Amino acid sequence: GSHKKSFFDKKRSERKW
Amino acid sequence: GHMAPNLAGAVEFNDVKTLLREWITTISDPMEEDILQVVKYCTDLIEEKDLEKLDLVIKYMKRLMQQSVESVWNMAFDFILDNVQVVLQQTYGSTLKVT
Numbered sequence A: 001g002s003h004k005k006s007f008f009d010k011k012r013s014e015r016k017w
Numbered sequence B: 001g002h003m004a005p006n007l008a009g010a011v012e013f014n015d016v017k018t019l020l021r022e023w024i025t026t027i028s029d030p031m032e033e034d035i036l037q038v039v040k041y042c043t044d045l046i047e048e049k050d051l052e053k054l055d056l057v058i059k060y061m062k063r064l065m066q067q068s069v070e071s072v073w074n075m076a077f078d079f080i081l082d083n084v085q086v087v088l089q090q091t092y093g094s095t096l097k098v099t
Helices: A007-014 B013-026 B032-047 B051-067 B071-091
Strands: none
Touching: A007 B013, A007 B032, B013 B032, B013 B051, B032 B051, B032 B071, B051 B071
């Protein structure tokens, strides 16, 4: 939902750098 | 949209390994989007000419994907390899023998 089912999408999104 | 070789924003291979291994251990079945991202990463190393890291990533994924033995991971790895092979040929005409 808020993040996709993609692991890397999640990782890129959690890294708000 | 050219970047320096990063996976989920991770440029350092140590951090990349951390991501790959976590992915392959926590995720039982890879999503096409993740697979394509690995794809885009491998081809990215090619363009940025850092075949050193590419070689290391390939072998690292081999270790993880084949330790999980399942066809989804095995096929995934081969799929990634294909990209690498073809793209290396497009660019340099020189491939890496992946065994």
